[PDB]
Design a protein around this ligand. Structure first.
Ligand code: EMC
Ligand code: EMC
Lengths: 425, 468
């Protein structure tokens, strides 16, 4: 690996039209200095592979503001009006690809695998194709997405995805030793790790450079072999997108969803009612919360002094982690998810993020507040792919008619129908 | 994760016929106590997915000795006589699958990926199929290997491989905290890490259990979510397979192969002349040696005191590691190799075609031990493949001929041939091309010993050698 004292010198040779992998999840683990360097060189017509597009005034958004990006390959581009603007006006190309798929396609690109199968996106516009990649100067679709080949394996359907590689990779890491090995801090890992292996030329910026020997050989997240160019970032704005500090119809659902948790259970909860339900978990009960951006053992929102920019949940909120928790990369995170290692997944044109991956495994129970159970203010429906909807719980005071009145499709009724349950304490 | 004080209680429910993933590389990182526990329960008809078969009296070999194994899925099974006898007697089934492929198929099995493509094994019996997975007691073929689907991507050919999953996984690890998170020590990692994610029930044995907080959250190799059953191993025999301690025709090739090394180069060297050549590397030159079992930055053989059972090279030899070295799992190791991140791959070989094809890992009826990681090492075009071998065969037969009398390792994957007599450059479209000749020999001499024709470089020069 070659060390650079100047960030612009490290990215000076990036050609216009090049496809560049950019690390980061939200504003966590983004290569600030390298992005700032691209603003200096002014390289354009870039195809940026980044999970998100940062925000309007920070992260990848900056390259959108300077219009140096021709195409974005991401999983979620919300919280950025500039993107929407350029996207709709038909001046920006964008491939909305599932997060887990994005992570795995990048890993494949670095592992010598040209293509693989995944159930993520099956029976979706990802698979079916037709999704608008680009609009025309008005509102008409110029470029559409091509369909994904489908194939069956052991009785299940999967779609074929191809490896993603870049000419360059702009990666953000924590430390680098003098040999070129690097490590990542907390959840600022995400896409930086795999992206570091899938480009002709990888450029890594770090907060600190230590001596060879500072790292235990077993704990080097990225071996020097993958680090082509290394630079120590000049400045680091520990920017937070959503500061979440700690100090009814909605209440019914929450108090009911809370009954879905079980001791020793591994679950992934979407921000909103699902996550809020975790607050009503018996202290005697142990539930391990997983976060698709690379965390196992999510804790409560931090106190003002606990706040850390390198630690946020999938919803982009600052969080804490409990004892016995662990961090890992985005590709490892979705292998965990795709592989059905998560017991329960409870959830409520910006992209699908990791939603499709979360419901991609048949070994994972999916509860809505593809699907296994639906919890709502009025009732609880069980779901069988072969039998269909089936009311199993009804809110005290309501009648099957009330449900029928509000429900769209018909549904069966369990001879065990009981009033909706609620967490005692 | 559930902790067990008794190993047999942790594996007591394994059904006969179950497929079990068993970690380890050679005798490095093998779950001794869990294997010992299987001997106690006596479960049989097992399909064991294990990179190797240990040795006759240790590791997986013990289950072969007790005949509890019906089928073995591995990449290399040498050094186990009981294996060889049972297989030839048609009492043991075996699927020899490339190491890198085995590692990736297991990862796929844990990552929800049913199938994927790899160039490893293309233009090989791995692709062709037909090989004997099992013999009949009369010598005929009871079970043959199926072909692998082929497909082209960006102008290259790849074969389709399917994910591997097990009912149980027997994993060996270093430490576990009270929450269930585990870490691995040095190169004892290999297959243990990925196998830990590809089974319905994983059983991990550790040498020590520490308190939650002992591990930095960033450095947990295997998160508790993958550890279903955990047990502290009762005893641990730090068994070494090949103790390697530090204190000609072969010499020519070595002294010439040493000049191939370049400063800042990442290389993988096969034990033998390729590895021996690293000894002649200018102290001013920096070469990083990669080991397929999960090491970057291999050092010299250890001094008697340095010897560590958790640290061996791909050749199963005890080694040391240099400053700034790193350890990683088998699937990561081959992602590195398959992805072409290694700059130079130098190995020995039996035959090499005028286009890059190579044969060096098997002899049809006199050496059916497996390809190990040989096919993965030549799978990338981005990696320069350099073969170092003696010019001719026994009665002076040809080795750099037109076709492979022996089973191919990889189609047009070799870039340079270094021998006692000459040095050939290899282009997939232009063919062989002598570029260096040993001082004193003539182009005729070469033509005499060489198999198929070859061009001559208008820059031909006397074969180079290292020194000051
Ligand atoms: C095909 C059930 Hg989402
Ligand atoms: C054609 C790459 Hg060996």
């Amino acid at each position: 690996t070659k060390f650079y004292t100047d960030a612009v010198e490290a990215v000076k040779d990036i050609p216009n039209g090049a496809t560049v992998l950019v690390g980061g999840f939200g504003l966590c683990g983004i290569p600030e200095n390298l992005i700032g360097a691209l603003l200096k060189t002014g390289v354009k017509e870039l195809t940026a592979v980044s999970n998100n597009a940062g925000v309007d005034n920070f992260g990848l958004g900056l390259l959108l503001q300077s219009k140096q990006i021709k195409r974005m390959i991401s999983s979620y581009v919300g919280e950025n009006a500039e993107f929407e603007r350029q996207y709709l006006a038909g001046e920006l190309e964008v491939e909305l690809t599932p997060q887990g798929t994005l992570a795995e396609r990048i890993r494949a690109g670095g592992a010598g695998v040209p293509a693989f199968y995944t159930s993520t996106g099956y029976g979706t516009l990802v698979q079916e194709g037709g999704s608008p990649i680009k609009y025309n100067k008005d509102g008409s679709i110029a470029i559409a997405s091509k369909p994904r080949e489908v194939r069956e394996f052991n009785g299940q359907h999967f779609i074929l995805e191809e490896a993603i590689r870049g000419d360059f990779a702009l990666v953000k890491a924590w430390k680098a030793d003098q040999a070129g090995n690097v490590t990542f801090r907390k959840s600022a890992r995400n896409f930086n790790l795999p992206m570091c292996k899938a480009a002709e030329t990888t450029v890594v910026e770090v907060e600190e450079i230590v001596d060879i020997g500072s790292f235990a050989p077993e704990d080097i997240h990225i071996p020097k072999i993958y680090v082509h160019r290394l630079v120590k970032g000049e400045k680091y704005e520990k920017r937070i997108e959503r500061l979440s500090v700690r100090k009814n119809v909605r209440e019914r659902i929450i108090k009911r969803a809370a009954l879905e948790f079980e001791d020793g259970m591994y679950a992934n909860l979407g921000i909103g009612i699902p996550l809020l339900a975790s607050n009503f978990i018996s202290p005697n009960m142990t539930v391990h919360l997983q976060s698709e951006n690379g965390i196992l053992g999510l804790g409560p929102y931090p106190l003002q002094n606990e706040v850390d920019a390198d630690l946020i949940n999938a919803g982009k909120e600052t969080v804490t982690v409990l004892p016995g928790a662990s961090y890992f990369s985005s590709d490892e995170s979705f292998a965990m998810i795709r592989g059905g290692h998560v017991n329960l997944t409870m959830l409520g044109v910006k992209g699908m993020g990791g939603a499709m991956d979360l419901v991609s495994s048949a070994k994972t129970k999916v509860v809505v507040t593809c699907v296994n159970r639906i919890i709502t203010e009025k009732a609880v429906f069980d779901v069988d792919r072969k039998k269909g909807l089936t009311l199993i719980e009804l809110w005290e005071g309501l009648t099957v008619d009330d449900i029928k009145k509000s429900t769209g499709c018909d549904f069966a009724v369990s001879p065990k129908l009981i009033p909706m349950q609620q967490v005692t304490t």
